[PDB]
Amino acid sequence: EVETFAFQAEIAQLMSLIINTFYSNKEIFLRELISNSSDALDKIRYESLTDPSKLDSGKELHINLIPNKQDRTLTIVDTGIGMTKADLINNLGTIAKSGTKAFMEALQAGADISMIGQFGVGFYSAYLVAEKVTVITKHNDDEQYAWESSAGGSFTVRTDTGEPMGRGTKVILHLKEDQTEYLEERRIKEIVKKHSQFIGYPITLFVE
Numbered sequence: 606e607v608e609t610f611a612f613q614a615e616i617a618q619l620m621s622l623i624i625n626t627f628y629s630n631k632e633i634f635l636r637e638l639i640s641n642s643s644d645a646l647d648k649i650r651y652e653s654l655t656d657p658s659k660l661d662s663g664k665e666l667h668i669n670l671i672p673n674k675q676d677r678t679l680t681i682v683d684t685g686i687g688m689t690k691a692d693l694i695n696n697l698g699t700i701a702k703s704g705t706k707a708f709m710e711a712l713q714a715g716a717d718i719s720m721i722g723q724f725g726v727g728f729y730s731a732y733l734v735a736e737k738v739t740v741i742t743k744h745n746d747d748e749q750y751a752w753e754s755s756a757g758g759s760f761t762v763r764t765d766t767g768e769p770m771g772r773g774t775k776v777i778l779h780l781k782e783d784q785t786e787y788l789e790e791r792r793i794k795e796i797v798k799k800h801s802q803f804i805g806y807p808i809t810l811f812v813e
């Protein structure tokens with residue numbers, strides 16, 4: 606069973622802006638996703654301080670980057686606190702409505718697209734490089750679900766089975782045809798060092 610939803614108008618407009626604005630500095634998408642992963646990891650870390658059983662679904666707190674040139678995908682995987690089905694539908698746990706409003710106002714005051722993460726909506730910068738995004742997540746309090754959107758005003762949510770993760774979130778970027786540089790090892794290393802050099806969790810770049 607697949608459920609199809611319409612984005613809130615403000616979010617559809619944010620995504621359209623990201624997709625259609627001329628802006629060459631696309632590489633900042635990765636730091637925004639790594640930042641979200643770090644936040645999710647902080648959350649499960651702090652929770653586990655008073656309830657160790659929260660880590661029964663996995664003790665290791667880390668981030669993996671997985672390029673695949675055959676599929677033309679870049680996948681960011683973390684073992685953070687994950688998201689419930691409800692939070693997936695509610696704009697994947699972000700304050701998208703109020704965040705988008707503040708972001709647009711900032712763009713009128715001299716801000717540019719690279720400031721997007723300051724307003725809680727950095728996830729949508731994924732559409733600078735991806736034609737489709739799949740978000741697979743598992744929270745301790747719910748089952749495993751897959752969110753997906755190629756923009757155009759809608760997203761889908763379904764249950765996900767076949768490769769269960771213990772806990773956390775996996776963001777699969779289906780890259781646009783002209784953005785395959787982000788599958789190259791030296792390019793990914795360069796971007797991590799430039800924008801995500803000091804993060805409180807290990808980042809592992811998989812080899813092909």
Ligand SMILES: CCOC(=O)NCc1ccc(-n2c(S)nnc2-c2cc(C(C)C)c(O)cc2O)cc1
Binds near residue numbers: 685687699740774
């Ligand atoms: C509510 C304040 O934060 C936001 O509005 N947005 C940033 C944010 C949202 C959800 C998460 N998150 C949680 S909680 N659990 N998993 C995630 C998570 C979400 C994403 C995007 C799909 C939004 C991600 O790339 C990685 C994550 O671990 C982390 C940061």
